[PDB]
């Protein structure tokens, strides 16, 4: 995939995830949980559908045509009839095969792309409160009960609320005299 998230830094999919194409697993003080993300899931589905409906839109209607089977040998004129029809099937077989190979290449990349888009969105929303662990997971540097997680999934998460707590946990250096702040 072009974007490197599905079969990329995401190690593998979730078979337990059965109500969405993309989502969030987490761990916090109240344990683990899972939720599909509807927006990115629908975005993929709408595009695939759009594509699906382009390709299967009924366009072809023909009635009286040339003969394509013959019961006697005639030479020149029958040669050309067979030639004409053989030439057409080949062109259409080629369009056919090219279409699905191209389309599938693209379906894979746009679904890889959605995953990637969801990951960057979540990252951008976290700001300085988390770090990209490099495998599709963010490590969140403050206390984040279930209400909190839900605020990141629904996009209401206010980073400012936690920035002080986060930065404080995040950049502690063992060798200097700066662990946590102890001012009240």
């Amino acid at each position: 995939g072009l974007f490197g998230a599905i079969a990329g830094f995401i190690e593998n999919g979730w078979e337990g995830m059965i109500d969405g194409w993309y989502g969030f697993r987490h761990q916090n003080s109240e344990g683990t949980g899972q939720a599909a993300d509807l927006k990115s899931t629908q975005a993929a589905i709408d595009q695939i559908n759009g594509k699906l409906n382009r390709v299967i839109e009924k366009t072809n209607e023909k009635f009286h045509q040339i003969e394509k089977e013959f019961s006697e040998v005639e030479g020149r004129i029958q040669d050309l009839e067979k030639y004409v029809e053989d030439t057409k099937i080949d062109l259409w077989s080629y369009n056919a095969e090219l279409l699905v190979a191209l389309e599938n290449q693209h379906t894979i990349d746009l679904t890889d792309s959605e995953m990637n888009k969801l990951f960057e969105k979540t990252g951008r929303q976290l700001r300085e409160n988390a770090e990209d662990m490099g495998n599709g997971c963010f490590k969140i540097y403050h206390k984040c009960d279930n209400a909190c997680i839900e605020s990141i999934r629904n996009g209401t998460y206010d980073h400012d609320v936690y920035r002080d707590e986060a930065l404080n946990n995040r950049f502690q250096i063992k060798g200097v005299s700066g662990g946590g702040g102890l001012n009240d």
């Binding site: 593998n12 995830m17 963010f138 540097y141």
Partner: protein, 318 residues
């Protein structure tokens, strides 16, 4: 002290392999098949008007072979010709048979209007044992076999004319009789050599009968050759002949539309389907099909592949 949030996508246990530009087979979660590769083996009697030839080819229905009389005036969206069709009238051929069959099939009608030809000085309505009609002798319903006059022993130049003052095209089917011996030729037509010239203002056909022995076909060695003339509105038919004329009795109305013809042995049965193949109706929800290159109606296009999977989901990583 902290939390971890994990972004992910779904997967299924075992998905479908598809082709791409760079991979021959790669696994995705769902795919859909784009080639129709099968048929029920039945031709749907709806929505097209199917007309089953049964024992009859289209041409035998046109000419009027007696066992085809039931087809008089029929109309069809599709005419179906069967393997077991047979001719049972006068042995005949049609120069350029494929074209008459084509143009009649495409017109979609056998509406026939008989006209008052006057054949002065000859005997009409001849028949053959090769074409029986009940226990009697007979002939193609639409053709008029002419011979020397009953008691004069003379055959004149017949010279008739028939104008098209209608607003449609008229189709005339006529013939020329090829005897087997000179005794037969002069016995039927008096003149040692016949002639048939059928013409319009801008076009003409003139035919010379062939005399000779031929293998028997239905007890006969003699033959008829079939010809046709289209006469547009405003033009005129003229028939000229001093022997061997198989006369037209009138015209076929001509139409333009979606009509056609198909060879097939598939039966016809109750269902609705826009697409017909010799192998039976097929669904047209897929863009392509691999059943038959011959089709009729709203049809998926014919490709050589028997399968083409279109991916409808992301790559599958379990």
């Amino acid at each position: 002290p902290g939390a971890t949030l994990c972004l992910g996508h779904h997967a299924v246990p075992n998905g479908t392999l598809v082709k791409t530009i760079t991979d021959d087979q790669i696994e995705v979660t769902n795919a859909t098949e784009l080639v129709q590769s099968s048929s029920t083996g039945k031709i749907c009697n709806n929505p097209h008007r199917i007309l089953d030839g049964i024992d009859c080819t289209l041409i035998d229905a046109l000419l009027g072979d007696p066992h085809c009389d039931v087809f008089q005036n029929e109309t069809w969206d599709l005419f179906v010709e069967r393997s077991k069709a047979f001719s049972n009238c006068y042995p005949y051929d049609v120069p350029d048979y494929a074209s008459l069959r084509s143009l009649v099939a495409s017109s979609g009608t056998l509406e026939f209007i008989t006209e008052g030809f006057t054949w002065t000085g000859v005997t009409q309505n001849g028949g053959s044992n090769a074409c029986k009609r009940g226990p009697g002798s007979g002939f193609f319903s639409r053709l008029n076999w002419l011979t020397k006059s009953s008691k004069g022993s003379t055959y004149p130049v017949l010279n008739v004319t028939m104008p098209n003052n209608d607003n449609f095209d008229k189709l005339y089917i006529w013939g020329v009789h090829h005897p087997s011996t000179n005794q037969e030729q002069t016995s039927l037509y008096v003149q040692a050599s016949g002639r048939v010239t059928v013409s319009t203002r801008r076009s003409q056909q003139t035919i010379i009968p062939n005399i000779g022995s031929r293998p028997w076909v239905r007890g006969l060695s003699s033959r008829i050759s079939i010809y046709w003339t289209i006469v547009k509105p405003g033009d005129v038919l003229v028939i000229n002949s001093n022997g061997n004329l198989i006369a037209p009795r009138g015209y076929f109305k001509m139409r333009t539309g979606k009509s056609s013809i198909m060879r097939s042995d598939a039966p016809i049965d109750t269902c609705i389907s826009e697409c017909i193949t010799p192998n039976g109706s097929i669904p047209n929800d897929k863009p392509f099909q691999n059943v038959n290159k011959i089709t009729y109606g709203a049809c998926p296009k014919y490709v050589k592949q028997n399968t083409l999977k279109l991916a409808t989901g992301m790559r599958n990583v379990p």
